[PDB]
Amino acid sequence: RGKLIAVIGDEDTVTGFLLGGIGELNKNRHPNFLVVEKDTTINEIEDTFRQFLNRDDIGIILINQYIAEMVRHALDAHQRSIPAVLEIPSKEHPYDAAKDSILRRAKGMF
Amino acid sequence: SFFPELYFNVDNGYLEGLVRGLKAGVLSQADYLNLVQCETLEDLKLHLQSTDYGNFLANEASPLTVSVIDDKLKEKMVVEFRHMRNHAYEPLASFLDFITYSYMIDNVILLITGTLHQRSIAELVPKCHPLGSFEQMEAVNIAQTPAELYNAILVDTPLAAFFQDCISEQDLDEMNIEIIRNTLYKAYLESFYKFCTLLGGTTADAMCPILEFEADRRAFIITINSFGTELSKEDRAKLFPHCGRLYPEGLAQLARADDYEQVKNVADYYPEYKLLFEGAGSNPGDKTLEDRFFEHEVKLNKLAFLNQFHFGVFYAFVKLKEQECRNIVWIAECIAQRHRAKIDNYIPIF
Amino acid sequence: IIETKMLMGEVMREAAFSLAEAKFTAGDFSTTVIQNVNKAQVKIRAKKDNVAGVTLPVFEHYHEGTDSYELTGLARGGEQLAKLKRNYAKAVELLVELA
């Protein structure tokens, strides 16, 4: 209820998750998501990420792996409990199995 | 009757030759197996290059993805279709106009819902499926007004005849877009069937059964999926095209159907659909009912190629070649995800 | 967390494969889906669990319950769409748990 999950991924992730149960337009007619394409650059990904961070009703952020690598500095610099950022691979992109900050902050793991 | 087999050649000999050649240029099951023996997208491109396909990714990005091959197949379809259409004459041109309306409907559906929710027209322009044209002005730059696009549809867009039943923008806002497209699709099938029956020759013989099966198929699946969703039974029955064996009887049992087995019972009275339902076991990990329907449609297309004096050959290769494109896409998906255990989930094109 | 991450990957790939099957069945539903987004049918409830002297933040998969979207235009592979919705719902629940 209180929070609305955001998504930042290539077309197949976005269309799959919108049918999945999530996604929303606020009263201001603003997407809580973003479809990335090959033409997308880093700055607007960063801008939307920060806009979501300031948006109180995000809660949980799901982003693709390579997108996270585009704005890795934004993830590492920002440290808070509320914005639960995640990492998911796309269909053609291989499995994500490392370089996750949540594992990095717990260095004592494997 | 004597009317066919005499006038047809006089004004469609070249087009019949061209379409028959392109039909002969299809990819056999052997070609599909050769493509399946790739294990990579680069080898898929090479296998495409061993036939008339391929040679289009040259001068493009080295990495290969599904979208690239899909766009290339679609572009080839569009180029050849437009090239053939341009060299045509009015009896065939109306036919190709019907074939284009079948996608005009999808495009007009896309265009609306970009005005009720304020969206630019130009950003929707590339999103429109090709063969869309819409080179007519005053449908572009409507100032995002539903009345403006409605008037543009009634005036410039040739679909005004079908839009004589979807009017006043009351259906445009209140009632679901999907049902709008379903009603317009039904009306378009009705008009197409009537025009085909006007040409009472080999063309009528070719296209009456195919459209009959298509409408009956649509009514069946309409009843299949309507169970789990909110839908008045009458609002379901009003979406059944009347140009089928179901209309004299059978549509009514579907209108009052409630579960999958009752729909099966309706299809049982007709053996042609009894075999398709029985083959459609709905098992977890086997073919499904719509695959049986696609197989039926493909074999009917192949049947249509046995006569020379019909306009149906053109519709036939269009359906068969887009089915070939879908098969290529599915094999690409199986390759990409490394699910080679499901490579055998595509309908052959003979 | 790594094992839940493997499960997340497996469920995501299953959902992607079902999406590929639906794409074969339908073709161009994605544009229709992305253009028409009205109200969310799954939201998140903020929750607290005081397991020690300090309070920890956790969340719940709160099914708000808005009706789904009948997509009966792209050859009408309703079976595929329902399967896709179910699989992505499971994926969302698992992801909320991990979050």
From Swiss-Prot, chain A:
The gene is Atp6v1f. It holds the Pfam family ATP-synt_F. Belongs to the V-ATPase F subunit family. Disulfide bonds: none annotated. V-ATPase is a heteromultimeric enzyme made up of two complexes: the ATP-hydrolytic V1 complex and the proton translocation V0 complex. The V1 complex consists of three catalytic AB heterodimers that form a heterohexamer, three peripheral stalks each consisting of EG heterodimers, one central rotor including subunits D and F, and the regulatory subunits C and H. The proton translocation complex V0 consists of the proton transport subunit a, a ring of proteolipid subunits c9c'', rotary subunit d, subunits e and f, and the accessory subunits ATP6AP1/Ac45 and ATP6AP2/PRR. Keywords: Cytoplasmic vesicle, Hydrogen ion transport, Ion transport, Membrane, Synapse, Transport. GO terms for biological process: synaptic vesicle lumen acidification. GO terms for molecular function: proton-transporting ATPase activity, rotational mechanism. Its main location: membrane. This is V-type proton ATPase subunit F. It is found in: Cytoplasmic vesicle, Secretory vesicle, Synaptic vesicle membrane; Cytoplasmic vesicle, Clathrin-coated vesicle membrane. NCBIfam families: V_ATP_synt_F (TIGR01101). One of its GO terms (cellular component) is vacuolar proton-transporting V-type ATPase, V1 domain. Subunit of the V1 complex of vacuolar(H+)-ATPase (V-ATPase), a multisubunit enzyme composed of a peripheral complex (V1) that hydrolyzes ATP and a membrane integral complex (V0) that translocates protons. V-ATPase is responsible for acidifying and maintaining the pH of intracellular compartments and in some cell types, is targeted to the plasma membrane, where it is responsible for acidifying the extracellular environment. It is a peripheral membrane protein. Coiled coil: none annotated. It comes from the Eukaryota.
UniProtKB/Swiss-Prot annotation, chain B:
It comes from the Eukaryota. GO terms for cellular component: apical plasma membrane; axon terminus; centrosome; clathrin-coated vesicle membrane; early endosome; lysosomal membrane; proton-transporting V-type ATPase complex; proton-transporting V-type ATPase, V0 domain. The modification Phosphoserine is found at residue 282. The keyword Membrane applies. Its main location: membrane. Ubiquitous. V-ATPase is a heteromultimeric enzyme made up of two complexes: the ATP-hydrolytic V1 complex and the proton translocation V0 complex. The V1 complex consists of three catalytic AB heterodimers that form a heterohexamer, three peripheral stalks each consisting of EG heterodimers, one central rotor including subunits D and F, and the regulatory subunits C and H. The proton translocation complex V0 consists of the proton transport subunit a, a ring of proteolipid subunits c9c'', rotary subunit d, subunits e and f, and the accessory subunits ATP6AP1/Ac45 and ATP6AP2/PRR. This is V-type proton ATPase subunit d 1. It comes from Mus musculus (Mouse). The lineage of its organism: Eukaryota, Metazoa, Chordata, Craniata, Vertebrata. The gene is Atp6v0d1.
Curated annotation (Swiss-Prot), chain C:
It is found in: Membrane; Cytoplasmic vesicle, Clathrin-coated vesicle membrane; Cytoplasm, Cytoskeleton, Microtubule organizing center, Centrosome; Cell projection, Cilium. Transmembrane segments: none annotated. V-ATPase is a heteromultimeric enzyme made up of two complexes: the ATP-hydrolytic V1 complex and the proton translocation V0 complex. The V1 complex consists of three catalytic AB heterodimers that form a heterohexamer, three peripheral stalks each consisting of EG heterodimers, one central rotor including subunits D and F, and the regulatory subunits C and H. The proton translocation complex V0 consists of the proton transport subunit a, a ring of proteolipid subunits c9c'', rotary subunit d, subunits e and f, and the accessory subunits ATP6AP1/Ac45 and ATP6AP2/PRR. Interacts with SNX10. Belongs to the V-ATPase D subunit family. Subunit of the V1 complex of vacuolar(H+)-ATPase (V-ATPase), a multisubunit enzyme composed of a peripheral complex (V1) that hydrolyzes ATP and a membrane integral complex (V0) that translocates protons. V-ATPase is responsible for acidifying and maintaining the pH of intracellular compartments and in some cell types, is targeted to the plasma membrane, where it is responsible for acidifying the extracellular environment. May play a role in cilium biogenesis through regulation of the transport and the localization of proteins to the cilium. This is V-type proton ATPase subunit D. It comes from Mus musculus. The lineage of its organism: Eukaryota, Metazoa, Chordata, Craniata, Vertebrata. The chain holds residues 51 to 149 of 247 of the full protein.
